[PDB]
Amino acid sequence: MNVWQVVGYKHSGKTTLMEKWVAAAVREGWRVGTVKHHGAVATAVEGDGLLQLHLRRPLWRLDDVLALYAPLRLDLVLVEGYKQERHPKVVLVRSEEDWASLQHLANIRAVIAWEPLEGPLAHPVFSLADDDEYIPWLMNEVRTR
Incomplete structure (x- = not known):
């Protein structure tokens, strides 16, 4: 699967x-999936092609969710969070301080920021x-x- 991550702190953008990314993908006609980190074991309500599910487990790992997406022939999966995972990611930063604590993540492909960043940068930086x-x-x- 073509999985990409979007990481950043609160109100980072x-x-x-x-x-905007989901909308552009949809317009191109792509099959898109998204994942965001926030007594029956499972509930499901279905109607009109839309299946709504609530599943409980001690812990859900991103891979558990992506396994459920596998059968859906998705062209793109955008994941918000799960910063420790190693999929290519876009890092959103409000400040140099945010960047200092997020620059050490894996597979960073681009940065979108509120302001310009200091020091050298191995990735393209865009304004939000x-x-x-x-x-x-x-x-x-x-x-x-």
Whole structure:
């Protein structure tokens, strides 16, 4: 599966990125899946092609969720959070301070920030306001799989 992660602290801009990225993928006609980290064991309500499920387990790992997505022939799965996982990721930062604690994550492909960052940077950095540029860039990154 083509899995990508969106990581960042509260109000970093991940909601804006997730929304715009999902919308562009949908417009291209892609089959998209998203995962976000927040007494019957399981409940399900179904109607009109839409299945709603509530499943309980001591602990859900991202891989448990992606295993449930496997059968759905998805072209792209956008994951918000699970920063320890190693899928290619876009890091959203509000400040140099946010970046200092997030720069050591694995497989970072790009940074979208509120302001410019200090020191050297091995990844392209975009302004959160510049989606006209980062969305087409990201879509291309996904396509060139």
